[PDB]
RNA sequence: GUGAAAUUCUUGGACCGGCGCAAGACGGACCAGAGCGAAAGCAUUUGCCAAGAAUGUUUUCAUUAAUCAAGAACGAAAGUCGGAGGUUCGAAGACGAUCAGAUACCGUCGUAGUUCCGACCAUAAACGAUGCCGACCGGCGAUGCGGCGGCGUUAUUCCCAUGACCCGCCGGGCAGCUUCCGGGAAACCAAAGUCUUUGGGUUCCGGGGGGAGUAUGGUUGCAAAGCUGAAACUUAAAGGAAUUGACGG
């Protein structure tokens, strides 16, 4: 009770941290072992007010620390991690804020379980946006 | 930094070493004195730069030949290093490894059927090529 | 003037190759022509590998990797400096560049 | 105004008898008020867990779905739901200069469980192999795939969900593929990459009890 | 001028000539 | 090798050469006698059989035809027939 | 979402996360200077239907062949017509940005289209910018198929075949490296070689650059357009390959 379980010292509680680290934004989302129930979600867009640094490591680590103190407020100790890119037909790589948010969570008194990639990879996608001539800049 | 000798001093040092090798030596101060008369060098700075380099090359040629060549040095270097002169020739082995394929080659040459050579079991596997591509 | 014997693409017994898309600009480029780069990346960069290993609950955990195969149109591969222009003689060399292992 | 975590409660999830470890972990859900029921909310929850967590000294690249079918107090009984290899492992097994073979079957368990089994296997080069690429001909792939279909449907169609899960925990099915296929084309990288369920036998309560017990 | 757009401009002019000749 | 003696090629390269490309054509296939096990008589079998051959006594199959050469089933004695 | 933004969606739960359901597209990694096809082109499993190269062949026919005006089948994408379906993408169009301007490049939406069936069109840098058939003329290592052999390892077994390798050989291929064969204006090419030491057979086809693939005639098409195809007039160069320099956001 009291915003946490009654688990003894012998066993620790495992959360799940979805790090949707794309370009232009990074999501850190802590949930239970099914993901059905959520504890906290903080993103760079709601942490920086410059509209450009939504994917910056500066805003990403601040998001990670905020969900970290909230997780400790709920007594969450261990944390399996699911890293996720944009996926689909678009980019399949994590953005800049993945490593900063990951490092911030470790250094904020949290424990780390297993990191796995849940990036959506199509067998073969639909027509990707941009035309056949690419994005001529 | 900045003490690199130029081709002017370098080449002139080599020529006077070859032409006057016995009149030189290991001492810089004697080398500059012989250089005063064995060649006409106008500048003092150029002179003792030449002598300084000559002293350095004397320390090198005394313990091994260089790009420069002395006719006396060549004969002495072939006169030395005559041989390791082992008490027996290095290739008078009492037993010599011989494959069966080479053994029949000597038989077809008619020079086989000797005692010194011994035949070995042919290696098995026929794997002698490196796997192709990267790694 | 024919710059390359293979026309810059590895098409010898075919007539048509299905197109893939550049990951950077999303440009339709033939699969035999695009620069392919299979990259294995650490999930945790070197700046945080110690933090994650220490904070990990597991006594011994090997960080998994990323297995993504990258396709670049030659414009984007040149801009990203994946491929560099070479001299006429050095163009013919097809061995991959050294990994700089030692 | 107030956070829901005040009215959230924590339940503990258990494991079937196939695994020597019982407690996967702890969950949370809202309480029961009006039409919404805490038991109904927790009905149908899928918990991706690692077999390394559920087993003492077995492999880590195998994961399990483990849907909860019933809750009894603060404990949530759980049966098998599906398996899947981790993305790191399945992506690392796909090497160049070799042939991948993929199979899929539909099998009705004696109990009534309709399972869709996906198996993957990769050709193997020999120790004295000098040729760079070790590929498989199309008929060899057809023979290997067909045999893989039948020595994976026989291991499940004649048995129950209990035996199938405790035999795929060490992946005896995969080793059966490798030793059979080595007579045709040698393989090394063979695993049942994924299974999933399609149909269930009308949700019998007694079957869950003997699944966790006798 | 790019030969393709010269070709397209030529096509437009041929349509005008066909329309003028049809009207007559 | 400019001055190769094409008049008398040595037999190791003559056998090496393709069947039609030799100095004089000579087929690689041959005729062999096959002794049916559990029988007494001798049948003639083409070394490159395309049809399944069965000697009259031996009701079993003698040769299983494949692409290049017949598969002589076990228990059959074979021997060449006059070059 | 962008370089930065904005139009746009959001307290009705947007995005995110979980469980399901539907839809129509699409078949990654494996996938290669690898295979097949006359080209265009062809990539999830299974089945059915015919077809095909090469190899094997001491089988049959016996000149039945090669290239081909006229004529004919197929023919990317886009486009046209009719019917289904419209997920994504996306001509036209609107709006936001950028700019001196921006009818654009960038961003949001989105029409025809993109998907299947039937009927058209017959064009692509439809490229190997390189006719087909045949003969000859260097070397080397690979690779795909078929065949023939040989130390050995591995699969099962009680023995051989039979598969996975290893070492070779033959034939047809996709190719690769090297070479003062030879050629070429050179780049380069074992074919673009065997060419003033010029003749193996046979198609198509060019004649300085423009005008111009235009006008006119015919013919094909629903249409867009396709095929055939000039002249007046104008011009001293236009070009191809390499060399040096100058410059490059
Ligand atoms: Mg150029
Ligand atoms: Mg083409
Ligand atoms: Mg907005
Ligand atoms: Mg079309
Ligand atoms: Mg229609
Ligand atoms: Mg759109
Ligand atoms: Mg001809
Ligand atoms: Mg002319
Ligand atoms: Zn690109």
From Swiss-Prot, chain B:
Crosslink site: Glycyl lysine isopeptide (Lys-Gly) (interchain with G-Cter in SUMO1): 103
Keyword annotations: Cytoplasm, Diamond-Blackfan anemia, Isopeptide bond, Nucleus, Phosphoprotein, Ribonucleoprotein, Ribosomal protein, Ubl conjugation
Full protein name: Small ribosomal subunit protein eS17
Disease: Diamond-Blackfan anemia 4: A form of Diamond-Blackfan anemia, a congenital non-regenerative hypoplastic anemia that usually presents early in infancy. Diamond-Blackfan anemia is characterized by a moderate to severe macrocytic anemia, erythroblastopenia, and an increased risk of developing leukemia. 30 to 40% of Diamond-Blackfan anemia patients present with short stature and congenital anomalies, the most frequent being craniofacial (Pierre-Robin syndrome and cleft palate), thumb and urogenital anomalies.
InterPro entries (UniProt xref): Ribosomal_eS17, Ribosomal_eS17_CS, Ribosomal_eS17_sf
Residues where Phosphothreonine is found: 130
Crosslink position(s): Glycyl lysine isopeptide (Lys-Gly) (interchain with G-Cter in SUMO2): 103
Post-translational modification: Ubiquitinated at Lys-103 by RNF14 and RNF25 in response to ribosome collisions (ribosome stalling).
Cellular location(s): Cytoplasm; Nucleus, Nucleolus
Binding partners and assembly: Component of the small ribosomal subunit. Part of the small subunit (SSU) processome, composed of more than 70 proteins and the RNA chaperone small nucleolar RNA (snoRNA) U3.
A Pfam family per the record: Ribosomal_S17e
Organism: Homo sapiens (Human)
Principal location class: cytoplasm
GO biological process: cytoplasmic translation; erythrocyte homeostasis; ribosomal small subunit biogenesis; rRNA processing; translation; translational initiation
Record-listed Phosphoserine modification sites: 113
Domain of life where this protein originates: Eukaryota
Keyword flag Ribonucleoprotein: yes
Residues that bear N6-succinyllysine: 19
Swiss-Prot record, chain C:
Residues forming coiled coils: none
Entry keyword Transport: no
Entries under InterPro entries matching the protein: Ribosomal_eS26, Ribosomal_eS26_CS, Ribosomal_eS26_sf
Similarity field: Belongs to the eukaryotic ribosomal protein eS26 family.
Keyword Nuclease: no
Broad class of where this protein is predominantly found: cytoplasm
GO BP, sorted A to Z: cytoplasmic translation; negative regulation of RNA splicing; translation
Post-translational modification Phosphoserine, affected residues: 53
Protein name: Small ribosomal subunit protein eS26
Subunit structure: Component of the 40S small ribosomal subunit.
Gene Ontology MF terms in the entry: cadherin binding; mRNA binding; RNA binding; structural constituent of ribosome
A Pfam family this chain is assigned to: Ribosomal_S26e
Ranges annotated as biased composition (Basic and acidic residues): 86-96
Swiss-Prot record, chain D:
Keyword Ribonucleoprotein attached: yes
Linked residues for Glycyl lysine isopeptide (Lys-Gly) (interchain with G-Cter in SUMO2): 14
Any one annotated GO CC term: cytosolic ribosome
Localization annotation: Cytoplasm; Nucleus; Nucleus, Nucleolus
GO terms, molecular function: mRNA 5'-UTR binding; RNA binding; structural constituent of ribosome
Family: Belongs to the eukaryotic ribosomal protein eS1 family.
Assembly with partners or alone: Component of the small ribosomal subunit. Mature ribosomes consist of a small (40S) and a large (60S) subunit. The 40S subunit contains about 33 different proteins and 1 molecule of RNA (18S). The 60S subunit contains about 49 different proteins and 3 molecules of RNA (28S, 5.8S and 5S). Identified in a IGF2BP1-dependent mRNP granule complex containing untranslated mRNAs. Binds with high affinity to IPO4. Interacts with DDIT3. Part of the small subunit (SSU) processome, composed of more than 70 proteins and the RNA chaperone small nucleolar RNA (snoRNA) U3.
Protein name: Small ribosomal subunit protein eS1
Organism expressing this protein natively: Homo sapiens (Human)
Full-protein residues shown: 21 to 234 of 264
Curated annotation (Swiss-Prot), chain F:
Tissue-level expression: Expressed in a wide variety of actively proliferating cells and tumor tissues.
Gene3D superfamilies: Zn-binding ribosomal proteins (2.20.25.100)
Compartment(s) of residence: Cytoplasm; Nucleus, Nucleolus
Protein keywords: Cytoplasm, Diamond-Blackfan anemia, Metal-binding, Nucleus, Phosphoprotein, Ribonucleoprotein, Ribosomal protein, Zinc, Zinc-finger
ZnF C4-type span: 36-58
Pfam short name (any one): Ribosomal_S27e
Subunit field text: Component of the small ribosomal subunit. Part of the small subunit (SSU) processome, composed of more than 70 proteins and the RNA chaperone small nucleolar RNA (snoRNA) U3.
Region (Disordered): 1-22
PANTHER family from the UniProt entry: 40S RIBOSOMAL PROTEIN S27
Cofactors demanded by this protein: Zn(2+)
Role, per record: Component of the small ribosomal subunit. The ribosome is a large ribonucleoprotein complex responsible for the synthesis of proteins in the cell. Required for proper rRNA processing and maturation of 18S rRNAs. Part of the small subunit (SSU) processome, first precursor of the small eukaryotic ribosomal subunit.
Cofactor note as given: Binds 1 zinc ion per subunit.
GO molecular function: DNA binding; RNA binding; structural constituent of ribosome; zinc ion binding
Protein residues bound to Zn(2+): 36, 39, 55, 58
Official protein name in the record: Small ribosomal subunit protein eS27
InterPro entries linked to this entry: Ribosomal_eS27, Ribosomal_eS27_Zn-bd_dom_sf, Ribosomal_zn-bd
GO cellular component: cytosol; cytosolic ribosome; cytosolic small ribosomal subunit; GABA-ergic synapse; glutamatergic synapse; nucleolus; nucleoplasm; nucleus
């Amino acid at each position: 009770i009291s915003l946490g379980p009654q688990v003894a010292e012998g066993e620790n509680v495992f959360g799940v941290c979805h790090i949707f680290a794309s370009f232009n934004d990074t999501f850190v989302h802590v949930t239970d072992l099914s993901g059905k129930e959520t504890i906290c979600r903080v993103t760079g867009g709601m942490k920086v007010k410059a509209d450009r640094d939504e994917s910056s490591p500066y805003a990403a680590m601040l998001a990670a620390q905020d969900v970290a103190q909230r997780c400790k407020e709920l007594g969450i100790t261990a944390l399996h991690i699911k890293l996720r890119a944009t996926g689909g037909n678009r980019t399949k790589t994590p953005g800049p804020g993945a490593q900063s948010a990951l490092r911030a969570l470790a250094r904020s008194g949290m424990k780390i379980g297993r990191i796995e990639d849940v990036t959506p990879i199509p067998s073969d996608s639909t027509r990707r946006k941009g035309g056949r001539r690419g994005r001529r800049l | 930094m900045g003490r690199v000798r130029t081709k002017t001093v370098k080449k002139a040092a080599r020529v006077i070493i070859e032409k006057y090798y016995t009149r030189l030596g290991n001492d810089f101060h004697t080398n500059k004195r012989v250089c005063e008369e064995i060649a006409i060098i106008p500048s003092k700075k150029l002179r003792n730069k030449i002598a300084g380099y000559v002293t350095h090359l004397m320390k090198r040629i005394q313990r091994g030949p260089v790009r420069g060549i002395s006719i006396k040095l060549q004969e002495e270097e072939r006169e030395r290093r005559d041989n390791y002169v082992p008490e027996v020739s290095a290739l008078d082995q009492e037993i010599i490894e011989v494959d069966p394929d080479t053994k029949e080659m000597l038989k077809l040459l008619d020079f086989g059927s000797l005692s010194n050579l011994q035949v070995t079991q042919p290696t098995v596997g026929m794997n002698f090529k490196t796997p192709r591509g990267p790694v | 003037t024919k710059k390359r014997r293979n026309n810059g693409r590895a098409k010898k017994g075919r007539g048509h190759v299905q197109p893939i898309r550049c990951t950077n600009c999303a440009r339709c480029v033939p699969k035999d022509k695009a620069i392919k780069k299979f990259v294995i990346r650490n999930i945790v960069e070197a700046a945080a590998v110690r933090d994650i290993s220490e904070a990990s609950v597991f006594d011994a955990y090997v960080l998994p990797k990323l297995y993504v195969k990258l396709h670049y149109c030659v414009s984007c591969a040149i801009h990203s400096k994946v491929v560099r222009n070479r001299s006429r003689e050095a163009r013919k060399d097809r061995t991959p560049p050294p990994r700089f292992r030692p | 105004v107030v956070d829901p975590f005040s009215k959230k409660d924590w339940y503990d999830v258990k494991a079937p008898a196939m695994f020597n470890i019982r407690n996967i972990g702890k969950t949370l859900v809202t309480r029961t008020q009006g039409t919404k029921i805490a038991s109904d909310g927790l009905k149908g929850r899928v918990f991706e867990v690692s077999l390394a967590d559920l087993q003492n000294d077995e492999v880590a690249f195998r994961k399990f779905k483990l849907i909860t079918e019933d809750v009894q107090g603060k404990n949530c009984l759980t049966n098998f739901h599906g398996m899947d290899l981790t993305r790191d492992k399945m992506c690392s097994m796909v090497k160049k200069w070799q042939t991948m073979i993929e199979a899929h079957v539909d099998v009705k368990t004696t109990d009534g469980y309709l399972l869709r089994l996906f198996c993957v296997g990769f050709t193997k080069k020999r120790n004295n192999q000098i040729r760079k690429t070790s590929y498989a001909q199309h008929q060899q792939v057809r023979q290997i795939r067909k045999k893989m279909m039948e020595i994976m449907t026989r291991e499940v169609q004649t048995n129950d969900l209990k035996e199938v899960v405790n035999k795929l925990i060490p992946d005896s099915i995969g080793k059966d593929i490798e030793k059979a296929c080595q007579s045709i084309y040698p393989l090394h990288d063979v695993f049942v990459r994924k299974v999933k369920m399609l149909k269930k036998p009308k949700f019998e309560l007694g079957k869950l009890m003997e699944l966790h017990g006798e | 001028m790019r030969a393709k757009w010269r070709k397209k401009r030529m096509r437009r002019l041929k349509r005008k000539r066909r329309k003028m000749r049809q009207r007559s | 090798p400019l001055a190769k003696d094409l008049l008398h090629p040595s037999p190791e390269e003559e056998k090496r050469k393709h069947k039609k490309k030799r100095l004089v054509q000579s087929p690689n296939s041959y005729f062999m006698d096959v002794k049916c096990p559990g029988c007494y008589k001798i049948t003639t079998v083409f070394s490159h059989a395309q049809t399944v051959v069965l000697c009259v006594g031996c009701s079993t199959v003698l040769c299983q035809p494949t692409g290049g050469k017949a598969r002589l089933t076990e228990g059959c004695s074979f021997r060449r027939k006059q070059h």
